[PDB]
Amino acid sequence: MNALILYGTETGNAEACATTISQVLADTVDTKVHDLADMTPRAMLDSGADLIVFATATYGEGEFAGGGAAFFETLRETKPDLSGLRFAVFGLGDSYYTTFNQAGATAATILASLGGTQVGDTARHDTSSGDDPAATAAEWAREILTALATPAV
Ligand SMILES: Cc1cc2nc3c(=O)[nH]c(=O)nc-3n(C[C@H](O)[C@H](O)[C@H](O)COP(=O)(O)O)c2cc1C
């Protein structure tokens, strides 16, 4: 299995999370990290990666941070088949705000609707918890490894 770890950020937290996730996953799956500001659905598909991990912050009206907004709009507009892919979502947000962690929820909805298969839970990192996002992402990445190793029965 090989993975792409894609981040949507404004102030750098999601970037740090993508990097930490990549280092945790690397002994089990080959990984590459990219900013959503420089990735598209077509380039994602072109890579041939079969696990796509998203680290996405929320801003505005529950919108994707950074490059995520245009990336997910291209998915909505073009609706490519993602049935060949597994995905996982690490959301960043802050319960100080309304639309708490809505970007991660929206990503999981859209990706599954196109046939992607989710691995693990959608994380909801909360800045108001005081926990460091990248540390939380590292712990979540171990949960994803456990999920990948877990059978139906
Ligand atoms: C102006 C502003 C609006 C925000 N809006 C939301 C929001 O709607 N929902 C949410 O859960 N977090 C919201 N956040 C919190 C950010 O998603 C959070 O700080 C996150 O860690 C930022 O990640 P980044 O550094 O990758 O941009 C907002 C933050 C700011 C500064």
Side-chain angles (χ1 to χ4, degrees), residues 5-9 14-15 17-18 21 36 53-57 88-92:
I5 319 299
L6 304 178
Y7 60 90
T9 195
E15 180 193 13
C17 292
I21 290 160
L36 290 167
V53 178
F54 292 85
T56 181
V89 182
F90 185 85
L92 296 85

Side-chain angles (χ1 to χ4, degrees), residues 23-141:
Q23 305 307 284
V24 173
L25 294 181
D27 262 19
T28 303
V29 50
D30 283 3
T31 62
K32 288 170 130 36
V33 172
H34 300 265
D35 190 342
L36 290 167
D38 314 314
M39 178 59 55
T40 62
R42 269 189 199 276
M44 175 191 71
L45 290 167
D46 190 63
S47 75
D50 48 10
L51 175 61
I52 319 299
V53 178
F54 292 85
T56 181
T58 304
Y59 287 91
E61 189 91 280
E63 186 59 272
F64 294 102
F71 180 98
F72 284 93
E73 180 56 22
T74 299
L75 285 181
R76 295 191 192 89
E77 287 195 353
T78 64
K79 306 176 200 68
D81 173 31
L82 303 186
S83 63
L85 305 180
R86 287 179 173 90
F87 71 91
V89 182
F90 185 85
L92 296 85
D94 184 344
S95 58
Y96 184 95
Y97 298 95
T98 58
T99 59
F100 172 61
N101 251 294
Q102 184 165 310
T106 304
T109 291
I110 295 170
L111 293 163
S113 79
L114 294 174
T117 297
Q118 188 163 6
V119 178
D121 293 340
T122 298
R124 299 191 305 267
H125 172 80
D126 184 354
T127 292
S128 282
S129 73
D131 293 336
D132 178 91
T136 301
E139 299 170 327
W140 174 86

